[PDB]
């Protein structure tokens, strides 16, 4: 019902190698378009999608300078956060950043976010008012006070309502055949007997976009979400996704179960049933 322009930062160190590694990726809905890895010889901001390929000379020259300097402040920030928690200098720690903006029908900004995480746990996060932060720890208060006195929330509120919305609108228009595409999944139910009285029904859903899909098993109308074994959505490789949902049923009762698929690429939800 909306669209998303999301960026992901990752900086982590290790013993011996000293100098940490910075990786930045950007996604428009479920398709990425930009890359920056500091392990390259001369790291540039490299495109990943065919619609950002054109653009203009400064867009790559400035975002390279933006990402290269972002790689520097986060290798210093890694030691700063470690010192806040007062940890040994020989270990290996990680810092992740996730900021973006969700836009609705006619450019409506529904929600803007900008959160950080240290060693996988939530560290600092911008509130939904986009004017102040929330801190998880007391060591994170050192970052909160530093970002409060610098007024970085007013800066953050200006990006999420301005450049984040326009660039997502620019991406959606230029990659219309790729982003606004709604490919429905090809579905089928396989049947694997597993024991003397049990068989496994696997409800497949292949080659669909976007990623959001619902796979539900039902036994004569009764929902079996607790009894099902759902698998995580996996990328097929060529911009689409795959998914399947398993369920162990008694042998001979396969006709009493139904798989229900819901996806925006299908005008109506599907209800499948196994056929020998």
């Amino acid at each position: 019902g909306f669209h998303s322009l999301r960026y992901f930062y990752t900086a982590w160190s290790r013993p011996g190698s000293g100098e940490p590694r910075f990786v930045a990726v950007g996604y428009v809905d479920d398709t990425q378009f930009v890359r920056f890895d500091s392990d390259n010889a001369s790291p540039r901001a490299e495109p990943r999608a065919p619609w950002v390929e054109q653009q203009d000379p400064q867009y790559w020259d400035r975002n390279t300078r933006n990402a290269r300097d972002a790689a520097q402040t986060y290798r210093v920030g890694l030691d700063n956060v470690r010192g806040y928690y007062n940890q040994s200098e020989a270990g290996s720690h990680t810092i992740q950043r996730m900021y973006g903006c969700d836009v609705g029908p006619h450019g409506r900004l529904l929600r803007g976010y900008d959160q950080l995480a240290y060693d996988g746990a939530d560290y600092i996060a911008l509130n939904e008012d986009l004017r102040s932060w929330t801190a998880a720890d007391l060591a994170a208060q050192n970052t909160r006070r530093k970002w409060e006195e610098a007024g970085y929330a007013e800066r953050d509120r200006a990006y999420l309502e301005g450049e984040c919305v326009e660039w997502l609108l620019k991406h959606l228009e230029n990659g219309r055949e790729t982003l606004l595409r709604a490919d429905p999944p090809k579905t089928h139910i396989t049947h694997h007997p597993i024991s003397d009285r049990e068989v496994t029904l696997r409800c497949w859903a292949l080659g669909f976009y976007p990623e959001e899909i619902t796979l539900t098993w039902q036994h004569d109308g009764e929902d079996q979400t607790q009894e099902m074994e759902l698998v995580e959505t996996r990328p097929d490789g060529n911009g689409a996704f795959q998914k399947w949902a398993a369920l162990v049923v008694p042998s001979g009762e396969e006709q009493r179960y139904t798989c229900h698929v819901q996806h925006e690429g299908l005008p109506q939800p599907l209800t499948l049933r196994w056929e020998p």
Binding site: V81, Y159, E163, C164
Partner: peptide, 8 residues
């Protein structure tokens, strides 16, 4: 277009 990178 990346945003302003704030230093923790």
């Amino acid at each position: 277009d990346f945003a302003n990178t704030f230093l923790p």
